Amino acid sequence: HKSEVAHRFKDLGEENFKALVLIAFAQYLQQCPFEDHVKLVNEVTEFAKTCVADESAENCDKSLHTLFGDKLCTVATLRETYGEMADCCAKQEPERNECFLQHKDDNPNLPRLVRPEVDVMCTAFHDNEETFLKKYLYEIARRHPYFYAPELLFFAKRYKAAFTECCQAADKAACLLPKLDELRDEGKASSAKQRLKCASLQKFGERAFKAWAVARLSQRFPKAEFAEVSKLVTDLTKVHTECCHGDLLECADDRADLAKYICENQDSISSKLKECCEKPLLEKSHCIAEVENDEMPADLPSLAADFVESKDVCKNYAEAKDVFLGMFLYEYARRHPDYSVVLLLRLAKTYETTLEKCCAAADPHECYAKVFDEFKPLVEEPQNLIKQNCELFEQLGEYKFQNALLVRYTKKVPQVSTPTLVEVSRNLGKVGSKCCKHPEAKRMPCAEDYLSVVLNQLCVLHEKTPVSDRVTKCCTESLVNRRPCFSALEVDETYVPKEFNAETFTFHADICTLSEKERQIKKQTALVELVKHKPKATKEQLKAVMDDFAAFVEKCCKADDKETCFAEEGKKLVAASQAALG
Numbered sequence: 387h388k389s390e391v392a393h394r395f396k397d398l399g400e401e402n403f404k405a406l407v408l409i410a411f412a413q414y415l416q417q418c419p420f421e422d423h424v425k426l427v428n429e430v431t432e433f434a435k436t437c438v439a440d441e442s443a444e445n446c447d448k449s450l451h452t453l454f455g456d457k458l459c460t461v462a463t464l465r466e467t468y469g470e471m472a473d474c475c476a477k478q479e480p481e482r483n484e485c486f487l488q489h490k491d492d493n494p495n496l497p498r499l500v501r502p503e504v505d506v507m508c509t510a511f512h513d514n515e516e517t518f519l520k521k522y523l524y525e526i527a528r529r530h531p532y533f534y535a536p537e538l539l540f541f542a543k544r545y546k547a548a549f550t551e552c553c554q555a556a557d558k559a560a561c562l563l564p565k566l567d568e569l570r571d572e573g574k575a576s577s578a579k580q581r582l583k584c585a586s587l588q589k590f591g592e593r594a595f596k597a598w599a600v601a602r603l604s605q606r607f608p609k610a611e612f613a614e615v616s617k618l619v620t621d622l623t624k625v626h627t628e629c630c631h632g633d634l635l636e637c638a639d640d641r642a643d644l645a646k647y648i649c650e651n652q653d654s655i656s657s658k659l660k661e662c663c664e665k666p667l668l669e670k671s672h673c674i675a676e677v678e679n680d681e682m683p684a685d686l687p688s689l690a691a692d693f694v695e696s697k698d699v700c701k702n703y704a705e706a707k708d709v710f711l712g713m714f715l716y717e718y719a720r721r722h723p724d725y726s727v728v729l730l731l732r733l734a735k736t737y738e739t740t741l742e743k744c745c746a747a748a749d750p751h752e753c754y755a756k757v758f759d760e761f762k763p764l765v766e767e768p769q770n771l772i773k774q775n776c777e778l779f780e781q782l783g784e785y786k787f788q789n790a791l792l793v794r795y796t797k798k799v800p801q802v803s804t805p806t807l808v809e810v811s812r813n814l815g816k817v818g819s820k821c822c823k824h825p826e827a828k829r830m831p832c833a834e835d836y837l838s839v840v841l842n843q844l845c846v847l848h849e850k851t852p853v854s855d856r857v858t859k860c861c862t863e864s865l866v867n868r869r870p871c872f873s874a875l876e877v878d879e880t881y882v883p884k885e886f887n888a889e890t891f892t893f894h895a896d897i898c899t900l901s902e903k904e905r906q907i908k909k910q911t912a913l914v915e916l917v918k919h920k921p922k923a924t925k926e927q928l929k930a931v932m933d934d935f936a937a938f939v940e941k942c943c944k945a946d947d948k949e950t951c952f953a954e955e956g957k958k959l960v961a962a963s964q965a966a967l968g
């Protein structure tokens with residue numbers, strides 16, 4: 387194509403082109419104000435329009451990396467604000483773009499993004515919708531410089547749909563706020579998952595990444611042959627490697643090529659890709675990534691014929707260990723879409739460890755004939771935990787389920803700071819909301835997906851404030867041992883009770899006014915502090931203090947003199963609670 391900027395403008399359309407140009411510049415120039423970014427986007431959009439009219443016009447034959455880099459180097463505040471980043475401008479392409487990628491800031495130290503009042507947001511959305519939605523993209527993109535720009539554009543369209551529906555409703559806050567909370571959580575999980583996949587690829591290598599992708603793709607495309615799944619794994623691994631390097635254009639072209647290959651070979655891959663493959667270039671790969679699991683070939687043989695009974699089990703294994711183990715993963719995964727990827731990797735690691743020992747023996751068959759008996763306890767351990775926790779979640783609800791988790795894990799790791807225990811237990815309860823709603827066959831893959839971000843948040847929050855050797859041990863374990871290590875945590879019986887502080891257990895009239903989330907956090911902070919002060923208190927002793935606390939809040943938020951009630955009845959509650967647990 388003669389003018390790459392014109393080709394992108396025509397394939398994306400004016401609306402998507404402007405949104406992606408704003409995201410790209412916001413991610414590199416994180417300190418510049420919104421209005422300066424609007425000026426850069428208008429100048430780039432107009433230049434792209436002169437190139438769609440006449441592809442031979444001045445600068446239209448330049449690469450998009452050259453045009454983008456040229457515009458970054460016209461920024462007045464470049465050396466003053468970004469320092470070393472202005473030195474990238476003295477270099478030629480491709481070294482200039484490589485230099486700019488290295489100087490992106492993962493923590494730009496910007497103020498917390500404050501959600502305004504609902505009436506204020508709806509009035510701004512009505513008066514200048516165009517600016518309101520571009521300010522969303524600007525504020526999110528500048529805070530997440532490595533979030534894949536077209537993925538951030540999908541979240542932006544869901545953000546618009548929440549205001550379009552809820553600002554016309556009778557109760558605007560009751561409609562909009564649960565939608566903005568769900569979107570905030572899903573956006574943060576998406577940002578964490580994108581970073582996690584790159585960190586795993588770098589810290590554990592290409593071999594481990596490929597085994598995960600074989601298991602995940604075999605569950606999604608069970609009718610595809612092993613050779614087809616293996617090729618898609620190699621292509622997907624290359625796409626992730628170049629996407630993790632950080633260049634938006636190399637990443638986007640890589641994803642489009644893979645989506646085009648999948649859409650040409652649909653009969654060899656899946657019967658669920660017809661609608662995805664008709665969608666435009668921007669949506670196509672995103673649609674394929676979230677495609678429904680295709681039905682597995684009806685009438686499949688037992689895994690014993692190829693992996694236990696056959697005479698060539700150890701001959702096939704020695705010939706190419708990774709290929710044979712990948713075939714076991716493919717065969718096991720396509721039959722079990724209900725399993726987590728890590729459970730499938732544990733079964734393949736168990737099967738690998740077995741063949742390493744048994745293939746050296748004189749009669750290998752006699753040594754590994756009972757290998758499938760070892761898989762039963764590994765499969766049932768996460769299945770029973772999900773059933774037990776989902777039946778507890780159904781009985782208590784998200785908030786009371788979060789409270790049961792707070793008491794349990796404060797007793798296990800009481801050295802972890804109260805904000806980290808509150809934050810992680812609240813998110814663990816949110817895992818129960820998003821995954822216990824799905825049926826049995828969809829719960830373990832969902833739980834694995836959200837626990838991977840929740841447990842990584844716990845590990846990142848813990849290493850900056852390291853307090854528990856056991857949390858450090860579970861965080862530095864292999865990926866298949868992380869969750870089982872945390873499940874193995876014992877109650878810290880040698881913890882010395884924290885000294886009592888009256889200010890901690892003092893409540894005020896503001897708890898009556900606070901939002902549901904801010905009110906819950908206050909009570910959950912006090913609950914963790916109560917458990918740290920009295921770690922040996924039983925569930926019946928803590929339940930009495932929690933019921934007495936609830937009745938106290940019930941009474942003082944109805945009283946005429948609320949400030950006097952919270953002060954007088956609160957002194958009695960704290961003293962009676964200390965005596966009950968003394």
Ligand SMILES: CCCCc1ccc(S(=O)(=O)Nc2ccc(NC(=O)CCC(=O)Nc3ccc(NS(=O)(=O)c4ccc(CCOC)cc4)c(C(=O)O)c3)cc2C(=O)O)cc1
Nearest residue numbers: 499500501529566569570571574575577578813816839843
């Ligand atoms: C089950 C667990 C799900 C939630 C979760 C997921 C992931 C984690 S984590 O692993 O600790 N990681 C993160 C933990 C925190 C963050 N947060 C940030 O970087 C702060 C910036 C940020 O994302 N802000 C944000 C982003 C989106 C939001 N939701 S929103 O509805 O889109 C929104 C955006 C903007 C406004 C208007 C502002 O007007 C001035 C109103 C609503 C909101 C919000 O509603 O307040 C806020 C990012 C990550 C990350 O993924 O890098 C923690 C919790």
Ligand SMILES: CCCCCCCCCCCCCC(=O)O
Nearest residue numbers: 534537625626629641671674675
């Ligand atoms: C989300 C941003 C990072 C992108 C990493 C590349 C992912 C490409 C997925 C293409 C779809 C293949 C099928 C599938 O993932 O199930």
Ligand SMILES: CCCCCCCCCCCCCC(=O)O
Nearest residue numbers: 594596597616619708711712734
């Ligand atoms: C394209 C196919 C290559 C990948 C095949 C997977 C082979 C290795 C599986 C070993 C068992 C899981 C443990 C691990 O390696 O992390």
Ligand SMILES: CCCCCCCCCCCCCC(=O)O
Nearest residue numbers: 891909912913932935936960963
């Ligand atoms: C030293 C003990 C002082 C008394 C502690 C009172 C605070 C307990 C808070 C418990 C909150 C449980 C949740 C709820 O009631 O909704």
